[PDB]
Design a protein around this ligand. Structure first.
Ligand SMILES: [Mg+2]
Ligand SMILES: [Mg+2]
Ligand SMILES: [Mg+2]
Ligand SMILES: [Mg+2]
Ligand SMILES: [Mg+2]
Ligand SMILES: [Mg+2]
Ligand SMILES: [Mg+2]
Ligand SMILES: [Mg+2]
Ligand SMILES: [Mg+2]
Ligand SMILES: [Mg+2]
Ligand SMILES: [Mg+2]
Ligand SMILES: [Mg+2]
Ligand SMILES: [Mg+2]
Ligand SMILES: [Mg+2]
Ligand SMILES: [Mg+2]
Ligand SMILES: [Mg+2]
Ligand SMILES: [Mg+2]
Ligand SMILES: [Mg+2]
Ligand SMILES: [Mg+2]
Ligand SMILES: [Mg+2]
Ligand SMILES: [Mg+2]
Ligand SMILES: [Mg+2]
Ligand SMILES: [Mg+2]
Ligand SMILES: [Mg+2]
Ligand SMILES: [Mg+2]
Ligand SMILES: [Mg+2]
Ligand SMILES: [Mg+2]
Ligand SMILES: [Mg+2]
Ligand SMILES: [Mg+2]
Ligand SMILES: [Mg+2]
Ligand SMILES: [Mg+2]
Ligand SMILES: [Mg+2]
Ligand SMILES: [Mg+2]
Ligand SMILES: [Mg+2]
Ligand SMILES: [Mg+2]
Ligand SMILES: [Mg+2]
Ligand SMILES: [Mg+2]
Ligand SMILES: [Mg+2]
Ligand SMILES: [Mg+2]
Ligand SMILES: [Mg+2]
Ligand SMILES: [Mg+2]
Ligand SMILES: [Mg+2]
Ligand SMILES: [Mg+2]
Ligand SMILES: [Mg+2]
Ligand SMILES: [Mg+2]
Ligand SMILES: [Mg+2]
Ligand SMILES: [Mg+2]
Ligand SMILES: [Mg+2]
Ligand SMILES: [Mg+2]
Ligand SMILES: [Mg+2]
Ligand SMILES: [Mg+2]
Ligand SMILES: [Mg+2]
Ligand SMILES: [Mg+2]
Ligand SMILES: [Mg+2]
Ligand SMILES: [Mg+2]
Ligand SMILES: [Mg+2]
Ligand SMILES: [Mg+2]
Ligand SMILES: [Mg+2]
Ligand SMILES: [Mg+2]
Ligand SMILES: [Mg+2]
Ligand SMILES: [Mg+2]
Ligand SMILES: [Mg+2]
Ligand SMILES: [Mg+2]
Ligand SMILES: [Mg+2]
Ligand SMILES: [Mg+2]
Ligand SMILES: [Mg+2]
Ligand SMILES: [Mg+2]
Ligand SMILES: [Mg+2]
Ligand SMILES: [Mg+2]
Ligand SMILES: [Mg+2]
Ligand SMILES: [Mg+2]
Ligand SMILES: [Mg+2]
Ligand SMILES: [Mg+2]
Ligand SMILES: [Mg+2]
Ligand SMILES: [Mg+2]
Ligand SMILES: [Mg+2]
Ligand SMILES: [Mg+2]
Ligand SMILES: [Mg+2]
Ligand SMILES: [Mg+2]
Ligand SMILES: [Mg+2]
Ligand SMILES: [Mg+2]
Ligand SMILES: [Mg+2]
Ligand SMILES: [Mg+2]
Ligand SMILES: [Mg+2]
Ligand SMILES: [Mg+2]
Ligand SMILES: [Mg+2]
Ligand SMILES: [Mg+2]
Ligand SMILES: [Mg+2]
Ligand SMILES: [Mg+2]
Ligand SMILES: [Mg+2]
Ligand SMILES: [Mg+2]
Ligand SMILES: [Mg+2]
Ligand SMILES: [Mg+2]
Ligand SMILES: [Mg+2]
Ligand SMILES: [Mg+2]
Ligand SMILES: [Mg+2]
Ligand SMILES: [Mg+2]
Ligand SMILES: [Mg+2]
Ligand SMILES: [Mg+2]
Ligand SMILES: [Mg+2]
Ligand SMILES: [Mg+2]
Ligand SMILES: [Mg+2]
Ligand SMILES: [Mg+2]
Ligand SMILES: [Mg+2]
Ligand SMILES: [Mg+2]
Ligand SMILES: [Zn+2]
Lengths: 150, 112, 116, 101, 140, 59
RNA sequence: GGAUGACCCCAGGCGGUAGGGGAGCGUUCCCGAUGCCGAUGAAGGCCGACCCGCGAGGGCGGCUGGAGGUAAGGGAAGUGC
RNA sequence: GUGGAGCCUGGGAGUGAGGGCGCGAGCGAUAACGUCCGCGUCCGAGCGCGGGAACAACCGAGACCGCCAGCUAAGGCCCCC
RNA sequence: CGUGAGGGAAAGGUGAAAAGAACCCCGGGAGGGGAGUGAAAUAGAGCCUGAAACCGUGGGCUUACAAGCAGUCACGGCCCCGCAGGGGUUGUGGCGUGCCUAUUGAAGCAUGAGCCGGCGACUCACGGUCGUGGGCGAGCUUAAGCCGUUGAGGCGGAGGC
């Protein structure tokens, strides 16, 4: 916001040479190599993202902590239902769950829980897989995921 | 016991007024009374106030009797300073600091 | 994000200054005057350890000599006796002996006297 | 009754009952060693030429440790050059049991 | 095992006659009795030598044309203030000086080598008023 | 003249070593022989008013 | 040696400015975190002759402070006077 | 002749003011702490260390750390020492 | 501040709550001492924390025949902590030419720095050329955009080597 103006004459003042108070070496003035707004995004090869999604699940299975399910019994979009379904399912949420299905009903009861990360199936991603402890996928979720690695 | 009075933010220079205090730091109450009365400094008045007043407190607020009193310690720390602008030739302004003092007189009783 | 100075500086300064208590004037009070005095101290140390070896030697040898005087020979022969004979007592020790074991020293003088 | 022993290029005089920590010796704590004699004195008086050939002194390794940090530091001027090195010398504190001889 | 440093000692007085004695060669000796370098428990940092008493200093001998051809010197700080006394004139006015000087310049400098020169009590003339210390006559 | 000026800042040592004399020195008082108050001698007593033992200053 | 830098034995090299290569310490921020420490005291400040590290440092203890701080492992820089 | 030798290909440099000394020459005056080449060396960068009274380059000698141990180098061994 | 166009500052925080200190005593007052509130008043309004330079009071060592880049090494004294160990200070001795910069060369009588604190200088984007960790391989790869999610990724073969 400052004026482009030399603040006292070059020689003979007795003080050190200065330009204007816009300069970084003055309190006030612009900072040197400042952060300027930018774009950290990049285009990771398509194959590498696939093998990512392959490997991630592939690891979770290989550990036993995967689980494909056909449909969700007593659960029509109402937490305590799911909550109790999950009980009969083999997860009491002492481990975190990544949970995938296109079914707003299911993943809605299944939202709000600490140990649950909700997902739709076209939105399967490798951070989220590794992020969690236990993957409980689902069958069309499974075919979208299978339609992927091809 | 020990009795204390303290005058702070007093518009005299520390360095000038320490010299009244070093003339008491030690003396009886009565000696400090008669010194700060014929001492020819400005500091005389200022310090003879604190003193006089700590010897209240000792009596009134602290159950002490005068003629056991003596100036046990008495120091002067330096208060923040009124900065002022005094103009010189060719337009320079220099800065006067009209300095400032925190006087302290601390009393005790002397058994003897 | 701004990684501002904040605390680092105060902490090395507080450091070097504490390394420098005891010093005269601002050599103990100013950071950069302490820092500067401490560069000094450093090499005066490293030198003076290497110095103190040779320093003591000189001390001992001067005593040793003073002893061999008392029995009629110089340091520089007494240490050729001791040599060519076979005695390998170093002079921290000779200096020790000669001070607090006069007779025990006298022996060696003699065997040196001899070994010539 | 005393001796003078070479142990790690360095000769100490040693009466029995002395604490004398010296240049770190390879000896699990508790064991005991023998140090050559170079001279014995008081009571008797032998003289090693260079060794006494005969006797020796026996002592117990009270244990090891590291010496109070010397702070070695070089500085060269007008050349932008410093160096801090920390130093703790390994030592082996002993207990002079008795002399032989 | 740590070096032996002496505890407090005793002031051992010592008496020397100069006469027929080559000034320099004498002072060598005076200085090292003075310091103490002749006794095993010597220590550079402490006053522990002897208490040299020299007498008959006036009958010291010097070689060569030196009685004249060698000169003492004394700046005074003023201009032209360099005094110059020659050996002969020195011996003839204060001979006790000639030897003192001879020694002081073989003692170290600083508060010790000064504190040492304090001890060398010199006289031209045979008798010396230091009887109450019984100076142990020495052969130089 | 060419404006002479201090060449180095004076240390606290010298600074205070100079003031080694600024030592203030207490007044000198004596007993009025009449009011027995302390006062400086040869003055007329400020407290009773007497001097050479007569009324002088109507306090 | 042994067995895939675990650690031991041996021999050797190790002054260094311009400058090149390496391995590390710390500051701010992010994932780790719906977590974990914390008024039985966070960060900050003031001591320490103790502990670890060659070192930059990091621990530990006491006083102060009075509501924050944030690990293993990684990431990003307005990163050290 | 296995050496912080060499050769090959790439990455990053800095340097392109040098100074003293010995020797061989030009210039100058069979002057210069002078100038300019050549061959060496040392300082530069070894203003670290012993000698030379002191003192970049002269002699001794190439400082990883510690030692209240030993032999030596130059140079010293009458006191300072 | 400048006639003017114009330049252009500094300066945030008590506490949970004002419960913001009645009344008393020295004081002309300022201020302080009791008392009273508060968890806390060295949170008392000049108010969180409260560094450093800088000024002072009190205490331990030391200092008036001594020569100094202020240190270092060694020994001794006195003082404290302790029970063959430490810490503090400094009497004597030995050694010893500040930092930075610029230079063939500086303690240098060559530069800069009163001191403290706090700001203060190798970056970002696109493009090259090497190296490097990974993916695919006679192949590799998407751009803008379309769809999806609002901290979910997919699509798109135009085009590029
Ligand atoms: Mg503008
Ligand atoms: Mg503007
Ligand atoms: Mg502008
Ligand atoms: Mg303009
Ligand atoms: Mg100017
Ligand atoms: Mg100026
Ligand atoms: Mg410009
Ligand atoms: Mg500003
Ligand atoms: Mg700004
Ligand atoms: Mg990038
Ligand atoms: Mg949730
Ligand atoms: Mg949520
Ligand atoms: Mg979770
Ligand atoms: Mg009263
Ligand atoms: Mg005017
Ligand atoms: Mg001013
Ligand atoms: Mg921030
Ligand atoms: Mg910064
Ligand atoms: Mg301090
Ligand atoms: Mg000191
Ligand atoms: Mg040395
Ligand atoms: Mg040697
Ligand atoms: Mg030998
Ligand atoms: Mg050892
Ligand atoms: Mg050191
Ligand atoms: Mg230098
Ligand atoms: Mg240089
Ligand atoms: Mg440097
Ligand atoms: Mg190192
Ligand atoms: Mg003659
Ligand atoms: Mg005029
Ligand atoms: Mg002072
Ligand atoms: Mg090695
Ligand atoms: Mg080497
Ligand atoms: Mg190197
Ligand atoms: Mg922070
Ligand atoms: Mg979180
Ligand atoms: Mg949190
Ligand atoms: Mg808890
Ligand atoms: Mg509480
Ligand atoms: Mg606490
Ligand atoms: Mg704290
Ligand atoms: Mg909070
Ligand atoms: Mg954290
Ligand atoms: Mg990290
Ligand atoms: Mg910056
Ligand atoms: Mg090489
Ligand atoms: Mg090479
Ligand atoms: Mg080559
Ligand atoms: Mg590079
Ligand atoms: Mg050229
Ligand atoms: Mg040229
Ligand atoms: Mg040339
Ligand atoms: Mg050359
Ligand atoms: Mg050359
Ligand atoms: Mg030339
Ligand atoms: Mg020439
Ligand atoms: Mg020539
Ligand atoms: Mg160098
Ligand atoms: Mg070289
Ligand atoms: Mg040299
Ligand atoms: Mg020099
Ligand atoms: Mg030299
Ligand atoms: Mg020399
Ligand atoms: Mg030898
Ligand atoms: Mg020789
Ligand atoms: Mg105006
Ligand atoms: Mg106006
Ligand atoms: Mg409010
Ligand atoms: Mg009025
Ligand atoms: Mg009031
Ligand atoms: Mg009061
Ligand atoms: Mg009040
Ligand atoms: Mg507080
Ligand atoms: Mg507070
Ligand atoms: Mg304030
Ligand atoms: Mg607060
Ligand atoms: Mg405050
Ligand atoms: Mg304050
Ligand atoms: Mg004091
Ligand atoms: Mg004294
Ligand atoms: Mg004198
Ligand atoms: Mg004295
Ligand atoms: Mg001198
Ligand atoms: Mg000491
Ligand atoms: Mg000294
Ligand atoms: Mg020495
Ligand atoms: Mg000096
Ligand atoms: Mg420097
Ligand atoms: Mg520096
Ligand atoms: Mg220049
Ligand atoms: Mg020049
Ligand atoms: Mg120049
Ligand atoms: Mg250069
Ligand atoms: Mg100067
Ligand atoms: Mg210049
Ligand atoms: Mg200068
Ligand atoms: Mg500069
Ligand atoms: Mg100024
Ligand atoms: Mg700063
Ligand atoms: Mg770069
Ligand atoms: Mg940018
Ligand atoms: Mg690149
Ligand atoms: Mg193939
Ligand atoms: Mg493709
Ligand atoms: Zn009267």
């Amino acid at each position: 916001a400052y004026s482009g103006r030399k603040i006292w004459p070059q020689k003979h003042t007795g003080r050190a040479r200065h330009g204007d108070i816009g300069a970084p070496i003055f309190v006030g003035g612009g900072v040197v190599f400042g952060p300027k707004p930018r774009d950290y995004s990049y285009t990771l090869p398509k194959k590498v993202r696939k093998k990512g999604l392959a490997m991630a699940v592939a690891d979770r299975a290989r550990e036993g902590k995967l689980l494909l399910v056909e449909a969700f019994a007593g659960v029509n979009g109402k937490t305590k239902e799911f909550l109790a379904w999950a009980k009969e399912a083999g997860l009491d949420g002492s481990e975190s769950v990544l949970l995938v299905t296109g079914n707003e009903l299911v993943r809605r009861a299944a939202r709000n829980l600490p140990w649950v990360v909700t997902l739709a199936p076209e939105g399967l991603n490798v951070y989220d897989i590794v992020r969690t402890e236990r993957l409980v996928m689902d069958l069309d979720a499974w075919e979208v995921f299978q339609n992927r690695i091809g | 016991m020990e009795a204390k009075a303290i005058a702070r933010y007093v518009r005299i220079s520390p360095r000038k007024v320490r010299l009244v205090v070093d003339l008491i730091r030690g003396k009886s109450l009565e000696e400090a009374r008669n010194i700060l009365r014929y001492t020819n400094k400005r500091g005389a008045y200022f310090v003879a106030k604190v003193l006089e007043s700590a010897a209240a407190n000792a009596v009134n607020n602290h159950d002490m009797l005068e003629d056991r009193l003596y100036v046990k310690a008495a120091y002067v720390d330096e208060g923040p300073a009124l900065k002022r602008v005094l103009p010189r030739a060719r337009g320079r302004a220099d800065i006067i600091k009209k300095r400032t003092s925190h006087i302290t007189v601390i009393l005790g009783e002397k058994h003897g | 994000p701004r990684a501002k100075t904040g605390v680092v500086r105060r902490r090395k300064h507080k450091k070097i200054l504490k390394l420098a208590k005891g010093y005269w004037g601002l050599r103990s009070k100013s950071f950069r005057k302490a820092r500067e005095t401490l560069f000094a101290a450093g090499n005066y140390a490293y030198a003076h350890r290497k110095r103190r070896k040779r320093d003591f030697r000189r001390l001992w040898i001067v005593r040793i000599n003073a002893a061999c005087r008392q029995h009629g020979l110089n340091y520089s022969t007494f240490i050729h006796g001791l040599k060519k004979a076979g005695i390998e007592v170093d002079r921290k020790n000779l200096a020790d002996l000669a001070v607090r074991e006069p007779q025990v020293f006298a022996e060696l003088v003699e065997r040196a006297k001899a070994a010539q | 009754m005393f001796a003078i022993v070479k142990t790690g290029g360095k000769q100490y005089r040693v009466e029995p009952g002395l604490k004398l920590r010296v240049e770190k010796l390879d000896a699990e704590p508790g064991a005991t060693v023998e140090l050559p004699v170079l001279l014995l004195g008081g009571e008797k008086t032998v003289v090693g030429t260079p060794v006494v050939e005969g006797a020796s002194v026996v002592a117990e390794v009270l244990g090891h440790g590291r010496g109070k940090k010397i702070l070695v530091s070089k500085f060269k001027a007008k050349v932008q050059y410093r160096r801090k090195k920390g130093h703790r010398q390994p030592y082996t504190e002993l207990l002079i049991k008795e002399i032989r001889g | 095992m740590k070096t032996y440093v002496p505890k407090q000692v005793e002031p051992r007085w010592v008496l020397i006659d100069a006469e027929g004695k080559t000034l320099g060669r004498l002072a060598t000796k005076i200085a090292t009795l003075l310091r103490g370098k002749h006794r095993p428990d010597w220590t550079p940092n402490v006053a522990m030598g002897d208490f040299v008493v020299v007498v008959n200093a006036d009958k010291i001998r010097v070689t060569g044309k030196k009685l004249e051809q060698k000169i003492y010197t004394r700046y005074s700080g003023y201009p032209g203030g360099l005094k110059k006394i020659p050996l002969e004139k020195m011996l003839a006015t204060h001979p006790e000086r000639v030897l003192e000087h001879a020694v002081k310049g073989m003692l170290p400098k600083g508060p010790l080598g000064r504190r040492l020169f304090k001890r060398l009590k010199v006289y031209a003339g045979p008798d010396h008023p230091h009887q109450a210390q019984r100076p142990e006559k020495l052969e130089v | 003249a060419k404006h002479p000026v201090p060449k180095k800042k004076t240390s606290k040592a010298r600074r205070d070593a100079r003031r080694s004399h600024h030592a203030l020195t207490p007044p000198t008082l004596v007993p009025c022989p009449e009011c027995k108050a302390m006062k400086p001698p040869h003055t007329v007593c400020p407290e009773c008013g007497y001097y050479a033992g007569r009324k002088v200053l109507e306090v």
